[PDB]
Design a protein around this ligand. Structure first.
Ligand code: A1D7N
Ligand code: A1D7N
Lengths: 299, 289
């Protein structure tokens, strides 16, 4: 039915603010380490970072965890990828069992968008095939993390770095490596041509059949084979179906509930490109990659 | 010296099993009570045919043997996960190590344990290319071979082999059942992602050359080029933006010091050299350590 976000409680208790000679962004504080974007110390390019971090004064890092009221102190500074690993005196007692998991495109995460070390908004996002997320950030939002939760463990996937004029956003995983070829420099950077995550677009139409209307007038009458669709997809900015073989279990499940084979869904996608004419599907006027098959099937 | 390093196959060898089904012979790996093998052992199917055709496959037809342990296994249930079959068998594998199913990012290296009839016959090294293919070596009956790495006591499975394409590229899934790239286990010609050089690895191999063979060869560029200037050239010349992996800069900057050649000269050498070639088989982590 709905777009589900993971509860932001564990992340709020670990957020901190990091300020360095005027530049201010967010960090996350797990055990005795604070992870924050490296450009808090300056807007350097290429291979300048190794030297500038090595001469960075640990005393110029003013770090405070506001929801815990305590102000931290940086003992050592280490660059790990495009992130800084500020080792601090105190161990965070709120640190959960966590894991640094890299996202593959087409997966979802909750964004805990923070300012001055406090979470202000949480929203849903899916890593696109251009390795960008379509999010919402203002100045000082860098260091905001994307995360998911399985049982007790906090699965951190993302830390925010860059906004690209088209309201796309880019960052690293928590290991410090970017998604895609983007880097933390204030320049125009070439972008991958947008391509739909077909598995998720299929999940959008199925979610519509399951909660809004089981027989919409735009639902195609005829089927198209997966193979015929994949031939059309290569010329129409749709990824090869299925993008992920594991999504087929969920997609076959949704077809059984909706009593609509995925061949009708794929053919509806082809027809919609020529005649959606403003149809609102699952509450959007777009093709949305926010609905993953797993979230639609499980809920 | 500096060599291409591979991981010992012994841990993989003791879990390899043969899987035969109605005259089709593949390999599989036996972890705990589950044998993981490619699903096309039951037949050549396309699209969404797989789910139904798997559900009608009688497990008595899955003849599974462990040749090194002398065991024959009896499959009890069959589950398709992604493009892989999960055959639950009665016996637990006493040789199951601590293992993890880790997905591989392009540019990384792994060791292939090339197997036939459930026996590892060859071991060799590959690097996942940016087109999401490995350039390996497989014959009929090698599907089920695994690519892996080791850290300590843990076996990190990354790859199970499925397909060979006309231009001697090979594609498969991870151990969770999802393919690398847009390729699928169907006997048709499939479009391939255009090739792109993993620049971090091309830089690692050139440094490896300056560290063992000829320090300062004559085809080294005399002048530096900017990282930023290289990346503008790279976008038009089939090289990935540098750095491919930000964590590789630690290794690469360390290589640049002992080689006493800045990375800006390596990059400008890469540009001048452009006249499977200039390979991406050396990762900076391997050369540096
Ligand atoms: C970190 N807090 C910000 C987040 C930005 C601010 C506006 N919306 C966001 O999401 N990141 C930056 O300020 C980042 C920093 C400097 C320039 N930069 C950008 O994202 C810029 N975009 S770009 C790469 O196209 O020039 C811009 C114009 C400030 C949004 C560096 C890359 C170091
Ligand atoms: C599994 N054991 C094989 C490995 C192959 C055999 C030759 N070298 C290899 O790496 N895989 C297959 O036989 C695989 C199976 C059938 C067709 N197929 C292929 O790899 C074929 N290539 S393709 C997709 O381009 O037609 C070929 C011609 C046999 C090499 C299916 C995809 C189900």
């Amino acid at each position: 039915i709905k777009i589900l976000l993971h509860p932001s409680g564990v992340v709020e208790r670990c957020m901190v603010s990091v300020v360095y000679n005027g530049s201010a962004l967010n960090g996350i504080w797990l055990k005795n380490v604070v992870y924050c974007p490296r450009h808090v110390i300056g807007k350097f390019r290429g291979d300048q970072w190794t030297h500038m971090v090595s001469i960075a004064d640990c005393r110029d890092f003013i770090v405070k965890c506001p929801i815990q009221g305590i102000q931290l102190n940086v003992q050592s500074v280490k660059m790990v990828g495009a992130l800084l690993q500020l080792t601090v005196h105190t161990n965070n007692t709120a640190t959960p069992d966590y894991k640094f998991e890299r996202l593959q495109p087409g997966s979802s995460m909750t964004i805990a968008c923070a300012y001055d070390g406090i979470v202000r908004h949480v929203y849903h996002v899916v890593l696109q095939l251009n390795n960008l997320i379509y999010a919402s950030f203002l100045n000082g939002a860098c260091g905001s993390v994307g995360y998911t939760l399985k049982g007790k463990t906090l699965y951190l996937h993302y830390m925010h770095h860059i906004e690209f004029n088209n309201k796309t956003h880019s960052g690293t995983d928590l290991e410090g490596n970017f998604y895609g070829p983007y880097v933390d420099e204030e320049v125009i950077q070439q972008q991958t041509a947008f391509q739909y995550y077909t598995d998720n677009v299929v999940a959008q139409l199925y979610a519509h059949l399951l909660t809004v209307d089981a027989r919409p007038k735009w639902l195609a009458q005829s089927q198209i084979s997966i193979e015929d669709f994949n031939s059309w997809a290569a010329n129409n900015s749709f990824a090869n179906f299925p993008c992920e073989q594991t999504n087929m279990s969920y997609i076959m499940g949704l077809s059984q509930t909706a009593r609509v084979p995925v061949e009708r869904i794929l053919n509806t996608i082809i027809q919609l490109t020529t005649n959606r004419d403003g149809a609102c599907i699952m509450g959007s006027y777009d093709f949305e990659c926010d609905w993953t098959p797993e979230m639609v099937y499980n809920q």
